[PDB]
């Protein structure tokens, strides 16, 4: 029985919460199919944002997903880095699966792309 | 063998080391009992505040638990929404248990009542 | 099948890519030799920074280690209390292991010693 991290990350043009909200709803969506995640399977969820989003907490994108309502999330601030990505947010989902490290589909979207 | 997360949630009128203390403590406790768990069974722990609490880190509530000592706890920044829930403290432990997830007791407590 | 996480933190002296590295290369490399662990074997990991730390994420560490590249590395900002310690740098990794917590061999380093 073994629990694996699956990173995920993205980045919005403005600090909406419709931009927000679709952004890293759309980032869920890719982690989701790309590593065929039950909701039941995920231990819990951690979802950051650099200092310089403050329109909604992204959490909230999770309310669209279907069955997910019980998947513990909280939201925290990213680490303030002179020169890394703005406008960040990123994910940390804690999943069991028996599928090997090298082999997880991590997801990285919009200008987060210059990560991956 | 299953990990699940469980929740919590506090606020504090004001940022003083010994409310902190209190009210963290209260969680903690109120987590433990509703969900029976035992210190060994628990992987890891993460302690977040909003900007706006400066007076004490509340892993130091965990002293006064019985049997703790040896928990892994780390202390965060949540994220800085404009209009979210002010002076909160979060909970996000981390617990080895067969208990379904739609099942978890997650404990939101203060004006954190409104996220529950 | 357990689950355990380890903690770890360091400190420097100057806000610079070269002893951030250098320090956060020192502390991860303290926690595998001191807990045998293997690269495979770790869920995720979580590092985290004081707000006076800017230079660079310490997370680019990492990547002198050998075998290192499939774990998840996300990076946050640690919580800002009054007179806490200061540039300090946090571990908290999750990994694989029949080790009973209270033998969890948790490494704190240079001004983190105070801690331990």
Same mark, same amino acid.
């Given at each position: 029985? &073994?629990?694996?991290?699956?990173?995920?990350?993205?980045? +919005?043009?403005?600090?909406?919460?419709?931009?927000? #909200?679709? *952004?890293? *709803?759309? #980032?869920?969506? /890719?982690?989701?199919?790309?590593?065929?995640?039950? !909701?039941?399977? +995920? %231990? =819990?969820? #951690?979802?950051?944002?650099? !200092?310089?989003?403050?329109? @909604?907490?992204?959490?909230?994108? %999770?309310?669209?997903?279907?069955?997910?309502?019980?998947?513990? %999330?909280?939201? &925290?601030?990213?680490?303030? @880095?002179?020169?890394? #990505? *703005? *406008?960040?947010?990123?994910? &940390? &989902?804690? @999943? =069991?699966?028996? %599928?090997?490290?090298? =082999?997880?589909?991590? +997801?990285?979207?919009? /200008?987060? +792309? @210059?990560?991956?």
């Amino acid at each position: 029985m &073994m629990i694996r991290g699956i990173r995920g990350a993205t980045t +919005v043009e403005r600090d909406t919460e419709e931009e927000i #909200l679709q *952004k890293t *709803k759309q #980032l869920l969506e /890719k982690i989701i199919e790309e590593n065929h995640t039950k !909701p039941e399977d +995920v %231990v =819990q969820m #951690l979802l950051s944002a650099t !200092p310089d989003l403050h329109a @909604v907490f992204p959490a909230k994108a %999770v309310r669209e997903l279907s069955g997910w309502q019980y998947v513990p %999330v909280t939201c &925290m601030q990213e680490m303030d @880095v002179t020169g890394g #990505l *703005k *406008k960040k947010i990123s994910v &940390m &989902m804690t @999943v =069991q699966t028996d %599928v090997p490290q090298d =082999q997880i589909r991590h +997801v990285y979207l919009e /200008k987060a +792309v @210059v990560l991956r």
